[PDB]
Amino acid sequence: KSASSLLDLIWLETILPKTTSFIQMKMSIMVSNQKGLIKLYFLSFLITIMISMTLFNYHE
Amino acid sequence: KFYIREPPHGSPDWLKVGLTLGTSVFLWIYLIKQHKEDVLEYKRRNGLE
Amino acid sequence: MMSGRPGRVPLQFLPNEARSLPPPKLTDPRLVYMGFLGYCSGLIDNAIRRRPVVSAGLHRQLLYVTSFVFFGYYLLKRQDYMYALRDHDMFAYVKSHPEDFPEKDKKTYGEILEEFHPVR
Amino acid sequence: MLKIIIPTTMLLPMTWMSKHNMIWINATVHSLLISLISLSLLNQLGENSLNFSLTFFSDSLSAPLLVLTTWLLPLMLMASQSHLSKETTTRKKLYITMLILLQLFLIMTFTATELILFYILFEATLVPTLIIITRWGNQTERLNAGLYFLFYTLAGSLPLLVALVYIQNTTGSLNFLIIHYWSHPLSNSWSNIFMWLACIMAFMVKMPLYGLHLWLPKAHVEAPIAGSMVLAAVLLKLGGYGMMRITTILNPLTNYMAYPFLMLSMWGMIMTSSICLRQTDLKSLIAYSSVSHMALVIVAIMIQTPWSFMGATALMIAHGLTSSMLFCLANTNYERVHSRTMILARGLQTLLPLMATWWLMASLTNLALPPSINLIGELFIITASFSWSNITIILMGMNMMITALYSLYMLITTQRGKYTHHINNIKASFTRENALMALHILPLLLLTLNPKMILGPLY
Amino acid sequence: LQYGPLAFVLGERTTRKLTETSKVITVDGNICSGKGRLAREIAEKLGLRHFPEAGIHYADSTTGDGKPLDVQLSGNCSLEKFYDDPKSNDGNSYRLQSWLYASRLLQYADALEHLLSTGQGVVLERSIYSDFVFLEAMYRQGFIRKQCVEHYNEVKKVTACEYLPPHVVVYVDVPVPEIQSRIQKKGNPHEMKITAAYLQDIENAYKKTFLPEMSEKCEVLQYSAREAEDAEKVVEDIEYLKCDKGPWPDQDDRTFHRLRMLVQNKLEVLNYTTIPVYLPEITIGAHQSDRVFQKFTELPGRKYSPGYNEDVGDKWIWLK
Amino acid sequence: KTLLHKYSDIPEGTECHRKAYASTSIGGATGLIVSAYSIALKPPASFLEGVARTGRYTFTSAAIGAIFGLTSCISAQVREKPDDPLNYFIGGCAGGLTLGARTRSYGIGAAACAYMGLTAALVKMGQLEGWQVFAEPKV
Amino acid sequence: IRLQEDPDPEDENLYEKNPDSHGYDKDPIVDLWNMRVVFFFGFSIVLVLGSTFVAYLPDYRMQEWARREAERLVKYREANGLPLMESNCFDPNKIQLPE
Amino acid sequence: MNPIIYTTLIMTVMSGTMLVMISSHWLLIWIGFEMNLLAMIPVLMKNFNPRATEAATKYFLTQATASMMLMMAIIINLLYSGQWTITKMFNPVAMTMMTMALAMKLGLSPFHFWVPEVTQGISLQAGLLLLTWQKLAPLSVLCQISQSINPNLMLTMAMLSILIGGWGGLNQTQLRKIMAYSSIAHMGWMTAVLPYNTTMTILNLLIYITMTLAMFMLLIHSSATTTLSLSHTWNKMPVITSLMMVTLLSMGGLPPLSGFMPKWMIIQEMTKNESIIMPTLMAMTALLNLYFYMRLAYSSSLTMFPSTNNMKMKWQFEHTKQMKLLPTMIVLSTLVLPMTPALSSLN
Amino acid sequence: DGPEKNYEKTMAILQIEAEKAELRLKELEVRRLMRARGDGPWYQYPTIDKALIDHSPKTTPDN
Amino acid sequence: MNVLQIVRDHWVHILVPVGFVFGCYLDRRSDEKLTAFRNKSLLFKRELRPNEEVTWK
Amino acid sequence: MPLVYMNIIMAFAIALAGLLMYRSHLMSSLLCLEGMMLSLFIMSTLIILNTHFTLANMMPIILLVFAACEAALGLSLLVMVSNTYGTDYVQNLNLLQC
Ligand SMILES: Nc1nc2c(ncn2[C@@H]2O[C@H](COP(=O)(O)OP(=O)(O)OP(=O)(O)O)[C@@H](O)[C@H]2O)c(=O)[nH]1
């Protein structure tokens, strides 16, 4: 109950492998689930234009 | 025989193999003549010969 | 390390002053590997067309190994050429700029005071 | 070192073109002969490493591992006879190609003279091992096994890549001899400890320490019988060679930075020993005992003591031999029973009189009892750790307290007692097996009689 | 030098060959309606190349030596056993149907290739737009599950789309008792135990679906066995047709080029017959797949490319 | 970038409140960036719930920024050692705990007290030792 | 039925069909040949002549040499009483004292 | 599609790119860009399916906007310097403007949502064309203007390129989509080293190119679009699927395969220039690529997949379209590491 | 072979290695200096040729 | 005894030995490219005898 | 930089907004796109007439000739989505999703 199961088969596998795999889980479906509407893509171009232009001020 | 259709490459395509061999020979003798003239040019260029 | 080098003729594989360098030997280990690199292309070709891999049309293998070893040879001269030029203007810049490369003084280990670390 | 490498590389077309049934014979014979050529390399001149060329060099640290790998290649080669007799001829030649490329990359790693080449071939081992584990595996979880092994090893390796290119940019070279001779004190700067972590964690990944030891248990269980011994035998020790060589620049920062991992090994080698009393699978049992032995060799490295180095150098060889030794037995029993449950079949001595004898000296070597090189390798570590921090003997005594409790437990619950009445297909032991454990155990005592060779490069 | 882009470049135009003798006619009808005899006499009467009904062993009849392979090696299904047991659902029903459908696809492919390369009208027995009837009826008797049926429709939409249709189709309409009398006359015991429900049912699936779904794209000339024995009238009125409906009258040399590109490469003709969807009967096990490989690759003339198989007696391989 | 300088100019410990205010502003800045991305790529239904989405995201990010700022400077003054990776660790990963509380899940908050804390320690590490994240072309 | 598979084959043992076999292959003659080759160098000269090779290897780290060359040093230095060892290996005189 | 018309579309695309990498006047660079745009839209519409129309429309909109912003940068540096010669910019915002204008044509930053979709729409041959040839022109322009590019801008843009390239491909089964995401990752890979030294981004461009032909030619030699469709091809083409696997190993950069060399070179020169944090991020995130690479490998070759009964008559037919250059295409993309010094040839 | 063989080979190994390593360090330094100052062969970025300009008298003077 | 057939089916056992000697010769080759300190060893300056001409090959 | 430059630059900025920020119409968006090039055409003609760049006088029409070509295909693409889909309203323009 302490060496096996809880430590090896519960804890260490949860922390490095499973937690990172779950991070990739949660950030793959919020990254690659866009419907395909040209609008929202183009406003993504939009706010990026100012963030590059004035907010960060890349040129400055 | 066997396959009733004539095999696509069932005959020795003589022209193509001819140019392949002729090329390989050309590339080879061009290569070794090239190497000989580079080495001779080198020795007569830097003062070896 | 280069495209802005003075007197650099464009679209010119092997410049004339490269010939002053030692041409790669026909038995150069790199060259013979790229000849072997020709064999892998030939052996795969028979495999793709599900032809007898070991001995399908040695004519195809011949150009595959001869063309690859050729284009390898010219590449090696250019390879040596750029490495020579990189080492050429190397020393020219160093000699023409003595101040930027001070003659560091050499001191034997009897004069330095390196402190030993007890590793226990 | 072309003398031994070139025969291995050019051996490949022999297997890839020979007759459909002479491939086994020819690969075996030529493996024994290139191992014969390999043992000529045990010579080591004074304290100079045996140099061969600008890119290849060896020494007394390397030579035992080189001749090890050359000696093993026949072992899984003819261990594969049972498990690959029914698959296609071209797949058989491909499997032999995988093994040969693996051995080639090992002898390339161990003879490496400059760091980044050692690294390239250091990661070149995953491709054959990954292919072997995934393709020729048996059960379902082998896919996740390959994932875990490959991803763990890479996630370790990439920081070492960045660190090595940084070393080349800063110091000026990555050749082993020069960085040992041009070594400088790695100060306590806050960039220096990350330098150390990048140069160490990579090797630590393929040296399963406490916490980061899931890939070995979840890969060796269902790895192919030939492959499993190769993983458990050598690629845990190329990391040890990595520490052996990279620690020349990591001092004196290693003095206090090693402490977290250091103790993580000692308590670690207890937990993986404490876990080792309770396993449902015999393969997992051997894997966990292996993990304990590598935690021992890890604490051997991190003290930076000549006696610690000797104990290590002996320990890689001894542990690899004994681990593969036990894995062969696990393969044999599983293949006869087509399962890998622990207490499925006890009392096998009543059916295979010589097989449990093999089990007996296998466990005895796992015990590290004197005068076997397992005991001497452990003993040098005992002395070094005592001279290090007095009490260390308490935890390490717990380890030389658990090791036999699980090793002889495996005997009593496999070979001793009585057979389980349901199983009736257990035939007489085939000469292939007992022959292979003969070639495994007899040289284990042969080179024990001559411990100078594997004793270490600081002799 | 097969039909390539260079062929179309230097002047190979299909349109210089198509004439009135370029009709893709198919004879259809119930089981054993005599439509094969009608196809034969129509083919001979109008100088049109006849093709036999593509059965289980069409692949070998079109490739290799022409000698039928094993059922396990080719099809794994038996129509005879389908008659023996159509309800066991071990797979023979729908595997049989799918193999027949895809053999019909290859038959239509080689028919269109022959027409585009030569210019001679082709007469078939059933086609892609006709075989569905059987499965529909086969589903009415319950011999095929619903998922197999919808997969067959999916593959039919996916495969028949690129293929423009026949010109005309002659249906040899035969009443069910006459069909039972004919199958009695034949004598092969497998086609005795055919349920009259199935016999009439394929007839409705033909009548209410095949004719009205086809008639817009193609001319219908459904006939009876009373007429189909007479070879004169059937071909005279086939000659006396406008053939002016469907994609056939309206497609230029470019569509012909694309079609001949597709048909001459049979590999992607039936690309989608690979069924990239998993169903019980259709799926063949991985171990089974590997084993049926190892007992097919060593088959003579099937390991290396034709003209490169040294086992069968090829020559000049080293300079091949 | 002047907003980032509004944090850099204030040294750790001295004038803790203005440093916390700068951290609030920076957290609000990244919050409004992510809220704009959400409002732009993810389609809402009504303006009120859209600005509600922006409000949730901004108020979260501002909470992490605020507590990180205040805790960092108080850790820098009570121990009077501004040059300390732990000074940033504690406040950075209490920010993770607050983020998990915001998304009403203390499991990801505990997982965050690892990652946000370590990253804050690493940015402090780099700021002390001049570690560059965007190195200029030099050689 | 759910799929058309070949059931799991029985794992034949070589002795049952072919007694006197060796667990090496199916054809007995190459079973023998594999026996000979493995019981060759494997247990033969690699295992034994290899044992002499490693046992009779030339001087290991010149230890056999370092043995003999150090009694002479010992004798030389006890002749004048200066002992077998020294506090310093490198010589203080040739190395300068900083400051 | 008339064969000769298709050829004349080939060479007008290629000439549009050639005009880009040989011209010096900025207007000529723009002209080549739209020549290529105007020429590649019809070939993307070769199949003429509504998905193809979708992909072509999205490509047209994205690239037309990008070229218009290209002229904006053009007009601004003309206004502030009166020099059409392509060199270091003399107005900062003009440089930034050109940076995003080219990036939208490359698919690096959030201006990358077009490429996965357009790759999904078109046929796989058009995919090879899009993801191989339509990079050379924007890379060449970026190489010519490396004197003054905001290093922060280029670095972050490459970072998102590789990061969303890795993450997007995880949840994709369509081989075209995962290839688009992998190409986005490689886009970030070369563009990260673009500011520092252009020889290495040229080398990585070459390796990514050869790998991409070696990839796409294997796909349409197997004729697969979904992961399951490729899995069914483990039977008919075992050699093709084994080479599938070996090049999928070269994908991530596992040594000693070819794909490791560009990563190694880029990281080594990044570390030469004190960028030590930066390389570790792509070094870690390449495992994201390796993940769906390994998934594709498992579906392809490592594990046998359930074939289909009908599939067996495919055994009777051979691939007739030769699709030349494939052998050397594989070989150059697999074993060129012992030839790393040859990079000096490009310099 | 005799110890003199390996030892004579190995100082040559070390000499070649060191004569490469200090060259690498000097190459880093030279590349940096010549990227910064630019007063040398490489890292010289292009400019405008002087041959394009025209000196012949124009329609209007003082241009 | 059909020697042609024996070499046809049994000729692989010959390629590995010729590889090993190849390696040996290649090692020999390596030595001649690495003779920088030809009798320049600072513990092995032993004088070159009038009979031979080299210290080692 | 006088007010005329401000006005045409600012016109380009709002053309960028109008085309790129789609509202619901593809035709009106490409209309904004071609207005974009009108703004750039005027802008380009300004410096060119101002600085007596005699050769560059031919650049605008050149710049013009290509730009309409883009619209020449744009609207051409517009019909091809229109006959099947029915309108230019880009919210049904969703079939290519995954
Ligand atoms: N299941 C199934 N069987 C089919 C299909 N098409 C044809 N068959 C079978 O093909 C066999 C031969 O049909 P026919 O050619 O009409 O019969 P026949 O006795 O040869 O006589 P003719 O019609 O004169 O040639 C019958 O067993 C049919 O059921 C189909 O799509 N599905």
CA-to-CA dists, residue E66 to D130, E63, E69, E276, E301, angstroms: 44, 6, 9, 28, 12
Q: C-alpha angle D138/D143/D144, rounded to 5°?
A: 125
d(CA H224, nearest CA chain C) in Å: 17
Q: Are A48 and H66 in contact (CB under 8 A)?
A: no
> Are the Cβ atoms of H53 and K53 closer than 8 angstroms?
no
- Angle (nearest 5°) at CA J16 between C59 and G46: 165
Contact check, Cβ <8 Å, G1/E91: yes
For residue E297, give every residue at least 6 positions away whose Cβ sits within 8 Å of its Cβ, in sequence order, or none: E303
Min Cα–Cα distance to chain H from F135, Å = 5
Q: What does the alpha-carbon distance between residue E53 and residue E131 come to, in Å, rounded to a whole number?
A: 11
Structure-token match 């060779």, residue found: D453
The answer to whether the Cβ–Cβ distance between C51 and E319 falls below 8 Å is no
Task: Pull the structure tokens for residue H149.
Answer: 């590019």
Find, among D88, D70, D76, D86, the residue nearest to D30 by Cα: D70
Long-range (24+ apart) CB contacts under 8 A made by A12-16 are A12/D211, A12/D212, A12/D213, A12/D214, A13/D214, A16/D211, A16/D212
Residues in a beta bridge with E124: E26
Q: What is the CATH number of the domain that holds K22?
A: 1.10.287.3510
Cα-based distances in Å from H230 to E98, H174, H249:
21, 10, 16
Residue identifier of the C-alpha nearest atom 1 of ligand 1: E97
Q: Verify whether the Cβ–Cβ distance K33 to H50 is below 8 Å.
A: no
CB atoms within 10 A of CB D251: 16
What is the A10 CA–ligand 1 centroid distance (Å)? 62
Domain that holds residue K18: 3-92
E78 is in an annotated binding site: no
Interface of A with K (CB under 8 A): 35-39, 42-43, 45-46, 49
Segment (H or E) for D57: strand D57-58
| 8 A C-beta contact, residue H77 and residue H91 | yes
| β-pair partners for D114 | D175
Rounded to 5°, the CA angle H59-H60-H63 comes to 80
> Annotation-wise, does E53 bind a ligand?
yes
Residue K97 domain flag? no
Resolution (A): 3.4
Q: Which of E26, E30, E32, E127 to mutate to test the pocket of ligand 1 (most atoms within 8 A of CB)?
A: E32
In a domain, K53, yes or no: yes
**Helix %, strand %, coil % for chain H, to 5?**
75, 0, 20
Distance from CA of F122 to the nearest CA of I (A): 28
Using CA atoms, how far apart are residues E96 and E82, in angstroms rounded to an integer? 8
The answer to whether residues H288 and H181 touch, using CB atoms and an 8 Å cutoff, is no
Q: Is D271 exposed, middle or buried (0-12, 13-18, 19+ CB in 10 A)?
A: buried
Q: Is residue K54, in this structure, part of any structural domain at all?
A: yes
Q: Is there a contact between H127 and H179 (Cβ–Cβ < 8 Å)?
A: yes
Q: Smallest Cα–Cα separation from F95: which of F51, F125, F62?
A: F62
Among protein residues, the one with the nearest Cα to ligand 1's atom 7 is: E31
Distance CA H249, CA H335 (A): 12
| Tokens representing residue D124 in the block | 């070149």
Contact J13, D29 (CB under 8 A): yes
* Separation between Cα atoms, residue K62 and residue K55, nearest integer Å: 12
Q: Are I45 and H87 inside 8 Å of each other by CB?
A: yes
Local structure of residue E248 (DSSP, 8 states): T
D127 touches chain J (CB under 8 A): no
| Pocket residue to mutate for ligand 1, from E35, E41, E53, most atoms within 8 A of Cβ | E53
How far is the C-alpha of D209 from the C-alpha of D194, rounded, in Å? 19
- Distance, in Å, from the CA atom of D41 to the CA atom of H37, rounded to the nearest integer, reads 64
> What stretch of H or E contains H191?
helix H175-193
Q: Taking a C-beta distance cutoff of 8 angstroms, is the pair D75, D229 a contact?
A: yes
**CA-based nearest residue to G46, from D1, D361, D67, D5:** D67
Percent helix / strand / coil, chain E, rounded to 5: 50, 10, 40
Stated as kind and residue range, the H or E segment containing H127 is helix H124-132
CA dihedral (E29, E34, E37, E43) in degrees, to 10, reads: -20
Residue J49, amino acid:
R
Residue K59: inside a domain? yes
Which amino acid is residue C64, in one-letter code?
Y
E191 is in an annotated binding site: yes
Q: How far is CA D198 from CA D125, D163, D194, in A?
A: 20, 6, 6
| Angstroms from H277 CA to nearest CA on chain K | 35
Identity of the residue in B2, B9, B10 whose CB atom sits nearest the CB atom of E65: B2
> Which bin fits B47, alpha (ψ -120 to 50), beta or left (φ > 0)?
left
Contact criterion met (CB below 8 Å) for D225 and D83: yes
H336-341: long-range contacts, CB 8 A cutoff, minimum separation 24:
H336/C37, H336/H207, H336/H258, H336/H261, H337/D120, H337/H255, H337/H256, H337/H257, H337/H258, H337/H260, H337/H261, H338/C30, H338/C33, H338/H256, H339/C30, H339/C33, H339/C34, H339/C37, H340/H261, H340/H265, H341/C79, H341/C83
CB D365 within 8 A of CB D329: no
> How many other C-beta atoms are found inside a 10 Å radius of the C-beta of residue G78?
11
Please give all residues whose beta carbon lies within 6 A of any atom in ligand 1, as ranges. E 31-37, 53, 79, 96-97, 100, 126, 131, 134, 186, 191
Separation CA D260–CA D200 (nearest Å): 13
- Length of chain G equals 99
Distances (CA, A) of E265 to E108, E261, E270, F60, H226: 13, 7, 10, 61, 22
Helix (H) / strand (E) element for E288: namely helix E286-294
Instruction: Give the separation between CA D206 and CA D213, rounded to whole angstroms.
Output: 9
- The upper half-sphere exposure of residue H89, i.e. CA atoms within 13 Å in the direction of its Cβ, equals 23
* DSSP alpha helix (H) spans, E28-175: 35-45, 58-62, 79-84, 92-118, 128-140, 146-160
Of A35, A37, A42, the CB nearest to K20: A42
Does the distance separating the beta carbons of A17 and D217 come in below 8 Å? no
Residue E188 counted as an annotated binding residue = no
Give the position, in ligand 1's atom list, of the atom nearest the Cα of E93. 1
Buried-exposed string H132-160: b where 16+ CB fall within 10 A, e elsewhere? bbbbbbbbbbbbbbbeebbeebbbbbbbb
User: In the structure, do chain D and chain F come into contact, i.e. share 3 or more CB pairs under 8 Å?
Assistant: yes
Chain D residues touching F130 at Cβ < 8 A: none
SS3 sequence of F42-88 = CCCCCHHHHHHHHHHHHHHHHHHHHHHHHHHHHHHHHCCCCCCHHHH
CB E125 within 8 A of CB E36: yes
CB H333 within 8 A of CB H258: yes
How many whole angstroms separate alpha carbon G96 and alpha carbon G86?
Answer: 19
Q: Which of D39, D12, D7, D31 is nearest to J21 (CA)?
A: D7
CA atoms within 13 A on the CB side of H4: 5
- Fill in the DSSP letter of residue E88: S
Q: How many CB atoms lie within 10 A of CB K8?
A: 20
- What is the distance of C-alpha K59 from the center of its chain? 17
G4 DSSP β-pair partners = E284
CA distance K77 to K67: 15
Q: Indicate the DSSP class of residue H25.
A: B
Per the structure block, which two tokens stand in for H96? 């930034």
Is K61 within a domain?
A: yes
Residue carrying the six token digits 């082993």:
D176
DSSP string, E191-237: GTS--HHHHHHHHHIIIIIIHHHHTTTSEE--EEHHHHT-HHHHHHH
Separation of E28 CA from ligand 1 center, angstroms?
Answer: 10
Rounded to whole angstroms, what are the CA distances from C114 to C111, C118, D170, D177?
Answer: 9, 13, 20, 20
Element (H, E) at E168: strand E168-173
User: Which tokens in the block code for residue D146?
Assistant: 């390959």
Q: Phi and psi of D149, rounded to 5°? A: -60, -55
Chain D residue numbers touching G45 (CB-CB < 8 A)? 36
Nearest-CB residue to F40 (from A19, A47, A57): A47
Q: Which two tokens stand for residue D198?
A: 């990048």
| CA dist., res. J35 & res. E31, Å (int) | 91
How close does chain D come to I3, measured CA to CA in Å? 7
**Is E232 exposed, middle or buried, given 0-12, 13-18 or 19+ CB atoms closer than 10 A?**
exposed
Q: Which two tokens stand for residue E144?
A: 């095929």
Best interface-test mutation with H: which of A16, A40, A41 has the largest number of H CBs within 10 A?
A: A41
Min distance A44 CA to chain H CA atoms (Å): 7
Helix H or strand E segment including D80: helix D63-83
- Beta carbons within 10 angstroms of residue D425's beta carbon: 10
Put simply, whether C5 touches D (Cβ < 8 Å) is: no
Q: Is E30 annotated as a binding residue?
A: yes
Cα(D58)–Cα(D72) distance, integer angstroms? 19
In this structure, chain E runs to a length of 320
G81: left (phi over 0), alpha (psi -120 to 50) or beta: left
Q: How many whole angstroms from its chain centre is CA E200?
A: 22
**Binary contact (G41, D338; C-beta < 8 A):** no
**How far is it, in rounded angstroms, from Cα C21 to Cα C13?**
15
Cβ-contact F33, A51 below 8 angstroms:
yes
**K71 within some domain:** yes
Tokens of D125: 């081992």
Distance E117 CA to ligand 1 centre (A): 29
**E104 carries a ligand binding annotation:** yes
Q: In chain K, how many domains are there?
A: 1
Report which ligand 1 atom has the smallest distance to the Cα of E104: 31
Note whether residue K98 is domain-resident: no
Tokens coding H24: 């010096």
The residue whose CA has the least distance to atom 6 of ligand 1 is: E131
Which of E189, E61, E82 lies closest to E135, judged by CA? E82
Question: Distance, CA E29 to ligand 1 centroid (Å)?
Answer: 9
E35 is in an annotated binding site: yes
Q: How far are the Cα atoms of D153, D306, H241, H270 from residue D158, in angstroms, in the given order? A: 9, 30, 28, 14
Site of tokens 């993801």? H131
Cβ of D252 within 8 Å of Cβ of C119? The answer is: yes
With 0-12 / 13-18 / 19 or more C-beta atoms within 10 angstroms meaning exposed / middle / buried, residue D189 is exposed
Identify the helix (H) or strand (E) that includes residue E169.
Answer: strand E168-173
K68 falls within a domain = yes
